[PDB]
Every structure is written in C-alpha cells, then in structure tokens.
Amino acid sequence: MDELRELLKAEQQGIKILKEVLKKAKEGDEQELARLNQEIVKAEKQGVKVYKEAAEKARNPEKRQVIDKILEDEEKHIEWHKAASKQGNAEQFASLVQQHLQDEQRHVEEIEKKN
Ligand SMILES: [Zn+2]
Ligand SMILES: [Zn+2]
Ligand SMILES: [Zn+2]
Numbered sequence: 001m002d003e004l005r006e007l008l009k010a011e012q013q014g015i016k017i018l019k020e021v022l023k024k025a026k027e028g029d030e031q032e033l034a035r036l037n038q039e040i041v042k043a044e045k046q047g048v049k050v051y052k053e054a055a056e057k058a059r060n061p062e063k064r065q066v067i068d069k070i071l072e073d074e075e076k077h078i079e080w081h082k083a084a085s086k087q088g089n090a091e092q093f094a095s096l097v098q099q100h101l102q103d104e105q106r107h108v109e110e111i112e113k114k115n
Contacts, residue, residue, distance in 0.1 A: 003054035007067070008111060010047030014074075015104045017043055018097060025094040030086060033093070037081055044078045070107050077103070 017039050024032040051071040058064035077100055084093070108115055 002059070003050075003057070003063070003067075004111070007047075007050055007054060007070075008108065010043075010050050010074075011070075011104050011107050011111075013043050014040070014047060014077075015101065018101050018104065021097055022094065022101075025090060025097060028090040033089070034086060037084070037086075040081055041078050044074045047074045066110060070110065073103070073107065 017036065021036050021040070024036050048071055051067045051074070055064050055067045055071065058067065080096070080100075089096075
C-alpha cells in the first residue's frame, strides 16, 4: 500500500482544472485561457514530479510500469497545450479538452481499475 491515493491527487487536480477549462473554453477569453493553460502546465508537471519520485521507489516493476506510462502521458498532455500557444483555440480547444478529460479518467482506471 504505497503511492496510490498520493498519485491520484495529481490526476484529481488535473481533472479539476480541466473542469474549469471547459467553462473558460466556452467563455472564450485569452486571459482566462492562458491562466488556465498555465495552471495545467504546473499541475500536470507536479503530477510528473510525484510519479517520477515514486518510480524510483517502485518495489515492483509493474508499479513503475503504471507510473512510467502515466508519467509519459502527463507530459504529452502539456506538450499539446503548449504547442497551441493560443491561435484561435475555443471551439477547436473544447473538442481537444474532451480527449484530455477522458484520458485522465482513463488514468484513474489505469490506477484503480474499479474506483
Ligand atoms: Zn494531464
Ligand atoms: Zn493521458
Ligand atoms: Zn493523468
């Protein structure tokens, strides 16, 4: 029983921000969007931090395997949001957010399976 609820905290935080991102995506404001983008970057990387930290303390390779997959995943998300750099991301943005949202929920399944 190690690094379970702790790691979920990262996903939970990311998902919680995504909820507001959905709101601001419909709002369509650069300041709100950039600020939220900024929040995402920090939150997801904080997730990477706890995952990477736990990875180097994985009693079982399978525990690292799950962490490593999400660790890679979580950075992938940021890379996408970073690559946007605000073009005209509103309608297009919301569509992509659905994927991030479904993905992090999948991360929960990858961890808990049945939560
Ligand atoms: Zn993420
Ligand atoms: Zn993912
Ligand atoms: Zn995640």
